Design a protein around this ligand. Structure first.
Ligand SMILES: *[C@@H]1O[C@H](CO)[C@@H](O)[C@H](O)[C@H]1NC(C)=O
Ligand SMILES: *[C@@H]1O[C@H](CO)[C@@H](O)[C@H](O)[C@H]1NC(C)=O
Ligand SMILES: *[C@@H]1O[C@H](CO)[C@@H](O)[C@H](O)[C@H]1NC(C)=O
Ligand SMILES: *[C@@H]1O[C@H](CO)[C@@H](O)[C@H](O)[C@H]1NC(C)=O
Length: 162
């Protein structure tokens, strides 16, 4: 299993993202020898993390020498819901036909919960990013935008955990 890592993003108005989650990139690509391969790359506890705050956009970037993954969270003030709305990936794969590439999708809606509550799920979710890339959220507790007393709000647990 991927390792559960903790994340805290703080900016001008304090903490805007709390997360405890295990993540894995599942990528299908063409190797130099013209063959297709599918590999998993776990987000490592060792990765460098950072992020940014705002009232429309909250980001978390996890990176190392060969890879940078950015999660973008959005929210709808009229509904007071937050959600993962985007994924950006930069990667270098030495054995790929195209070694250095990017994959993105900014039309996502996952990990959705009420603003002021936290999203929690222990059931693996394979989030489609492109035909060739999924973000596997192996387990997660996450909260974006509004954070009170620097801790998770009440849990909204995915139905599948039942
Ligand atoms: C902080 O709050 C102010 C006032 O609510 C808002 O205008 C500003 O965009 C917020 N900044 C961040 C980084 O969330
Ligand atoms: C990917 O690389 C481009 C160009 O260097 C950069 O603008 C972008 O922020 C990078 N994306 C991530 C998620 O680091
Ligand atoms: C934002 O919330 C309002 C109120 O529920 C709704 O009318 C609107 O369609 C929502 N936007 C999106 C993108 O869901
Ligand atoms: C991005 O993800 C959304 C949600 O699954 C999907 O509807 C859309 O087709 C995706 N875009 C691409 C280019 O894969």
């Amino acid at each position: 299993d991927p390792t559960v890592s903790k994340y805290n993003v703080t900016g001008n108005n304090g903490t805007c993202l709390l997360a405890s989650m295990a993540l894995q990139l599942n990528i299908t690509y063409l190797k130099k020898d013209n063959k297709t391969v599918t590999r998993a790359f776990n987000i490592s506890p060792n990765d460098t993390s950072s992020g940014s705050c705002g009232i429309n956009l909250v980001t978390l970037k996890v990176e190392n020498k060969n890879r940078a993954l950015e999660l973008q969270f959005g929210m709808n003030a009229s509904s007071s819901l937050f959600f993962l709305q985007g994924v950006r990936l930069n990667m270098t794969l030495p054995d790929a036909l195209v070694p250095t590439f990017s994959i993105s999708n900014h039309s996502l809606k996952a990990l959705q919960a009420t603003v002021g509550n936290s999203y929690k799920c222990n059931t693996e979710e394979h989030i489609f990013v492109s035909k060739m890339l999924s973000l596997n959220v192996f387990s997660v507790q996450v909260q974006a935008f509004k954070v009170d007393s620097d801790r998770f709000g009440s849990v909204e647990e995915c139905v599948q955990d039942g």
